[PDB]
Structures are given as C-alpha cells and as structure tokens.
Amino acid sequence: ADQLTEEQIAEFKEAFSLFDKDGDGTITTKELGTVMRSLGQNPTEAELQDMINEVDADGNGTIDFPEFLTMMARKMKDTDSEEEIREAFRVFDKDGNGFISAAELRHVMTNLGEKLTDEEVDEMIREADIDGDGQVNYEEFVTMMTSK
C-alpha cells in the first residue's frame, strides 16, 4: 500500500526527458532513428514501421506514458531471455568486454549531451565498485541493479 509514491513516475519520466531529445516525450521512428542513428546504425524505413507495430499496443504510431509502462508491465509469461540486459552490457563496453573503464564509458557517456565528464563518472564508478578493484565488474552490476 505505497504505490501512491512518486519515485516511480519520476524514474520513467527521467528516461523520457533524456531520450526525447525533442519535447513530445514519446519513442517514435523519428526519435528512434535519431538516437539509434547516433549510436552507429541506419536501418531502412519499412523496417522501422515494423518495429512500431510489434510494440504499439494502441496504434498512434508513437508510444507515450500508458503505452510505455504497458510494454514494461504487461509481461507475457516468461521466456527466461536475459539477452536484452546482456546487449545493454556489451554496448557500454565498446572495447574489451568484462569491465567498464572511465575513458571507455566517458565516450559512451558523452555521445548523449547532458553534463557529465571524468570527475563525475568517477564518483559513479567508485561508488558502484563496492569492492574497489578499480573497474566495474558484472557482479556489482547485477547486484546493484538487481531486480528487487
């Protein structure tokens, strides 16, 4: 009996404010193509529409707030597929794979355009590296962002 909090709507809301580099606040083909293209890709057009229907429950061409949570909430049973999170992992690591470095992430953290650098990230990797070996491993990663 605490779902009346605001930490939730605040978390997802932050994702958009960062993703929707425009203002609408919805993941669309133009918003996806832009960001996605900034990573290093360039799929066709018809391929995008297919990427929309396969996830656009309603059909407004773009998913908003209810649709977003509905896609992350409406979990059709379970397939035990951890490939998703995995990919996100291989992404952060542009070079070697198994640990995160300051310089490595810095580049993957600058691609965006917020207000981070080496010092700030340092506080993020340091606090994240509970052990303190020097870099972030998979444990501290699957132990800090673990599915409560």
Partner: peptide, 26 residues
C-alpha cells in the same frame, strides 16, 4: 538520484525496440 538507472533504462528502450525485430530461426 544519481545512478546508472535512467542511463541503462534509456538504452534499454532503444535496444529492446531493435530486438523486437525478430531474433528467431524457424
């Protein structure tokens, strides 16, 4: 307030969208 959350989640939105493609054989 300061974590790799909003960061990982964001990429997850664009990554999942891509994975939604197919990723399957027969």
């Amino acid at each position: 307030k300061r974590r790799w959350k909003k960061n990982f989640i964001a990429v997850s939105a664009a990554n999942r969208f891509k994975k939604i493609s197919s990723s399957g054989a027969l």
